[model samples]
Target: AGFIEDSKASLTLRNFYINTDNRSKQEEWGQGFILNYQSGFTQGTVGFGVDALGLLGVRLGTVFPLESNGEPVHDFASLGLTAKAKVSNTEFRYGTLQPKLPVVTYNDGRLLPVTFEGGQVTSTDLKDFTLVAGQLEHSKGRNSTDNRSLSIAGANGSSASSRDSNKFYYAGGDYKVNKDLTLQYYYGNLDDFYKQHFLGLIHNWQIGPGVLKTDLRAFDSSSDGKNGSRSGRADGYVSSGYYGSGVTKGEVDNRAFSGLFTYTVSGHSIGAGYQILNGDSDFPFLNRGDGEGSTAYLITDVQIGKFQRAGERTWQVRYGYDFATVGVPGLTFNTIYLSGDKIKTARGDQSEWERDISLAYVIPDGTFKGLGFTWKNASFRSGDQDENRLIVSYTLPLL
Candidate 1:
């Protein structure tokens, strides 16, 4: 019994790839491993326990050619470790962290996901409230083990500059109002760049024999510190043009409001959503390469479909089905189509549209229990650019 208790752990292996047919023929593929171990609490009124995670990755392919004029594509790999300590229902974690919050998040779209080196605390002491707060100090770039400071995209300074601060602060709370309603609020501040607030309302109601789900989300954002004035400059810096352009440079207000409704019947689910962006500047956050990996404040975000433009309005339709109701217990499929027109950009009116599809399967039992596979495809067309992407992935879980 003691041996069995001490041996509790889980391992996950994932194989992933993303291929873009257009935009210079980009392709990325890699395999990853995640091992997690947890310990039971020691005997005491205030017991103690620890958990750890080990992560590794190996690269397989690239999009760019050798001896290219721009950044060279190379085979890359890294290892990450995270440790955690818990007392009661509260836990403190340090080292590598992958946050999924709106203000600060890790992007896992490429060969590997970005991670932060920091500390965080979570508590569930309140009856209906779950509270989370954290401060991050450094980051591990995708496919790299070297720790570096954080920098917002379009900021006027190098992330490696001495003046750059790695500290990012965040706090949030989620309240369950009832069996079908929830309220959420969060605050995030990236040092020297901006402070953001997010508010959300979620409701699920029964209509006749069907259930309806509604989601309402909003955000308020403004710049701060040097980012407010666009005064700092460093090597390898990308300018935001906050002061010279007609764009609202320095301090700015950005907001978005969206509502999504979905209804499910038997094995089929249908959803529709509408969102509007009201900001002179592009939706603000840590941006990476055409806003990939950046989360948007909208429900119409299907795969690479953000429809995010200055003074933009977007509408979406989605459909999904589970195969279990038809005797296929492990298969699922989803498809989405979105279009955004009446885009008010500085260059005049523009429009974009995207269609995305996904299929997934999981082995429910036997030797391959917890094994999963997924395939995703997306096509996007705009006035100036067009892209198509396909992704295939597999996961194996060990426990």
Candidate 2:
């Protein structure tokens, strides 16, 4: 009875449409259905439970995928299930996971979310500390039905450069110093690829009329076993960067630092941020180039560009407003402008800029309450790209 009494279920529907104009035009429209169910632990010291997630995407008007002869697929779907156990202040989970850590972040920008197959354990036994450790084996992309192994930038799902590893190990913890300050450290290692260390600091302060938030993060990455030798690079254990004529391809060498500050008062919020990419290689993260999507934990992982090129120095300014303070309870607007320079290219140093704008609204009352709508637009100067996205979403609770 405990398990059934505490169970919950919800179904979400999203209509997504996106278009991009770059060297060529690409457009896709789809309706996504996400069903989630979670069962509470049984009544015991070491209780057990099960959870399930089902995802379905139906193509509308035009879709992104094409056959060998350029034809779209009608639909796609997948299902995930998890088994879990808990005791005291610790919990363990096996099967499907969506981890949001410093080194591994799931992408949710598309119609569906990326899913991972892994084992994870989280503990909060200490007074002001949290611990997490995990090992991942495979990933199912947002637009892919096949669960594939993991790879970095240069060796991702390319016919000419095919290299992959199934195991990724990560461990980290966070310490809450006070009510308004926190510190974090994490380590991640991709077998035969790269080893990365992350350090983060977050603080919040209340001023006269507003609250100011600060975020600082740094990452150091170096090559691992097969990624450190010339012969290994010839075998496809390579990373992406601007290696000179005599430099090797497999070495993973990079350091990234970022700081962002934001202030909010009443209905207005303003932000400023800067990021620098040092060393010879670009930032490393889990990426699969099989027509799927990926995300990195960076201040400049924007809609149109990531600003992660080697030797790039980037800065951004942003503004946001909530209409609730002025009478409209569910409307919001946000815009950001970013410029990057000193990009290391074979020819010379290059520069680029991007701007992103978005508007969103939700029904405040009546029968249509909880319904959401959003429109996003972005432009990038370096790639000569323009993009737009429209999304309408609603969720139904069924317990």
Candidate 3:
């Protein structure tokens, strides 16, 4: 057997706040630490090694209530650890982990991120194919130490025991065809709830001196669990409400298609994209309510405007510039405008639009080698809604 090897660690401090203008306010500050270690493989025809990660988070600020009269929550903290083993070109991992699947996504939008307790296997035995499979059992939310069961949005309300699950299975494969094209296929199933299949094609074509990229994605999904039946209702659940008639079992056949084209010349880039959602139901994700647990569909999707009402049509234009060509390296800026109409709400017809601008700079050298700063601003206005947001973030790395 080979000897144990390298070790590494880092510390990060983050400060964050999200003011909904009229909804509620969320403010948080935290420090994070990561310790990683790897051991050498055994010397043999088949080799094996062990990897471990220790993560810790300490909260620094008060959590404000979503309601004006609600009490402010105080400091909170958590810790997590993960272990992995590898042999040949395959790997197996367990314990708290972040997953990036269409059906079960790990959200990292808070002071700390959400994680799942599960086991996963990945292999790269083929020259052009990478495969993965996993089963998740529990979840640790962004700010809590309590390990709880899994439930879809609207599966249950504020009650912790209303909805629970023991299995979330997923598998996928990515194939690389050439330098300019690739294919992706994945399947996800949340036991007794729903099953989804995804197909994606990504290609980059050379048009003159610039390149034209195309990303075409599609999904086919159906219900399977208790809620999947006609008597199934997603009401009073943590997830989004049913897209079908609320009284009957809600099953949705949703599909979204978007095309984005960008051309870069010198330091300037211009792009345009159009996205459409064709489903009798609202775009599904973790939440379905007006308050908590909401997910949107548009790429320009910001905190305020998802532009994802049923029967929604959206168009966007974006422009960006890099300052390096003008002698200011590590600095960049971008702005976008998005508008949508034909929003099919029960009340009546409505439309919405948003304008966003961002500026960022990173220290290129000296004592602040990896230091960076960003400012994001947006304005969203609708027939009966209006809001704005300003986010500033800075990072310092301790290695």
Candidate 4:
């Protein structure tokens, strides 16, 4: 039956508007709907398929905190399902997941994009190797729709509820060493709240006319089971905002480092980097529950300070352009500047800096083919006040 004759379907419409001034008038507006369906498997030796996601959120204002006497909130829905299987190259999936790996990643930046409920396995059986394993307990945020309890970034960085965890485990692999090198590793655990390891290296070279890329990252964190005890840092499993009139503090010590370089020609590109977070706490990943959202693949995870406090030291510069090499085939641009200093907050050693700008466009043909436009600008200095964002997106296809 050709698996239901090549089944496929789509229904996506995303339109989100947000405003962040922080002059005490914080805000968010939304309109997101995605009903994507997939089914194309089943015809022989172990093959089955069923994938779906239907989400809808319509609130034209605020992060939902109105209704009591001011009325301006109503709209929230989410439903996800998955059960897939395959053989010959390997594949298996189960229930709602949206991971962007480097260590359990999933967050759509806001307005519908975070969902992880468990089960995954993938393999490519050698040849530029790619293998992955997964397990997730709970996550649902993009302005929450209720599921939570997976912790990290403890005490002081509080996702507050007195330290709770629901077993999140992960495994990873990726190896491609030809056509310019690539290697990566991943491991994650959030049981009693602490356990992480990541190493990555990517390189590409073809200098002289364009192309020279190199990036390296390393992180090692430790502390597990009541977050490495002291009676769980007096019950809150403190970590992630280290302190120590000088050294030793509530568990989870750290080490972080990164190096970057880039150079591209024809369409212009440049990059620079240096980051080190050495530790006592204050450099952990996988944010927390309702309070500090979460997403990190670290290039400084910038946009408004993610220099990751506690003995922080950062410096970065980047610029990118690819307007179809000048005829503007679909526009693209990026800008970022970050500067951080010592920053081991407790009221001593502090400094901050941030600058980010982005522009995007998509409409390379007639009939407004997938029209989309975006502009973002942010300037920060810790007393935080300069921010701007405007986004418009479009996508529609259902069958």
**Candidate 2 runs further than 4 Å off:** 61-69, 246-248
Colliding residue pairs in candidate 1 = none
Q: What is the lDDT for 378 in model 2?
A: 98
| Per-residue lDDT of model 2, residues 22-80, tens digit only | 85898899999999999988989998999998999888912234556657677888899
**Candidate 1 lDDT over residue span 20-111, tens digit each:** 66546766666666566666655544545555656566666232223335453444445555566666677777777778875666766554
TM-score of each: 0.84, 0.96, 0.81, 0.32
**Alpha carbon lDDT at 283, candidate 4:** 72
Candidate 4 lDDT for residue 97: 80
lDDT (Cα, tens digit) per residue for candidate 4, span 55-102: 887887324424557665577777888898878778889888888887
List clashing residue pairs in candidate 2.
none
- Give stretches of model 1 more than 4 Å off: 1-8, 42-50, 61-76, 156-165, 230-252, 288-292, 384-399
Candidate 4 error regions (>4 Å): 1-6, 9-97, 100-104, 107-134, 137-189, 194-240, 252-284, 287-342, 345-347, 367-399
Who wins the TM-score comparison? Answer: 2
lDDT of 2 at 337: 97
